[PDB]
């Protein structure tokens, strides 16, 4: 019957999970991966300069 205003927070279709001390696998709206896990499996030149024996 009356005008109203609501306070609320964001949500989305994210499936990204994150861990904490008290809880594991917490789905979260946004997360940043900070661990690199891939390499090119090759020995390469370093900044335009290796001696391969």
């Amino acid at each position: 019957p009356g005008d109203q205003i609501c306070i609320g927070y964001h949500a989305n279709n994210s499936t990204e999970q994150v861990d904490t001390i008290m809880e594991k696998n917490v789905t979260v709206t946004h997360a940043q991966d900070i661990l690199e896990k891939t390499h090119n499996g090759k020995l390469c030149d370093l900044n335009g300069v290796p001696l391969i024996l």
Epitope: C44, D45, G48, I52
Partner: nanobody, 120 residues
């Protein structure tokens, strides 16, 4: 040693095609990109192209994209170049050269030079 033995001097009728070969020896064929250089008799060096043996990826100069074709015989430890429909322009010397590392590399071992003569 790092020897690069290449094809013997050749003569081609204008409009025909050549296929000079370069035989690698002394190192692992599949670790370095091989390239071809053209030198207009006592003038300037021009870069033609490069090919990496292990998977056969090619990298060409604008100028030669059409007329040239780098190929590699892995069992043969051999790099080939093919020049199609020649002119007086192509009469010069061609060097089969091993470049050290990648896009930013220096050509350390230069072959003898296959010298092509285009005349009727």
């Amino acid at each position: 040693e790092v020897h690069l033995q290449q094809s013997g001097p050749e003569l081609v009728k204008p409009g025909a095609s050549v296929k000079m070969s370069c035989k690698t020896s002394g190192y692992t064929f599949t670790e370095y990109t091989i390239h071809w250089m053209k030198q207009s008799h006592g003038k300037s060096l021009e870069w033609i192209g490069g090919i990496f043996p292990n998977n056969g990826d090619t990298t060409y100069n604008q100028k030669f994209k059409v007329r040239a074709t780098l190929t590699v015989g892995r069992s043969s430890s051999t790099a080939y170049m093919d020049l199609r429909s020649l002119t007086s322009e192509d009469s010069a010397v061609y060097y089969c050269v091993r470049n050290y590392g990648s896009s930013y590399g220096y050509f350390d071992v230069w072959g003898a030079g296959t010298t092509v003569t285009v005349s009727s």
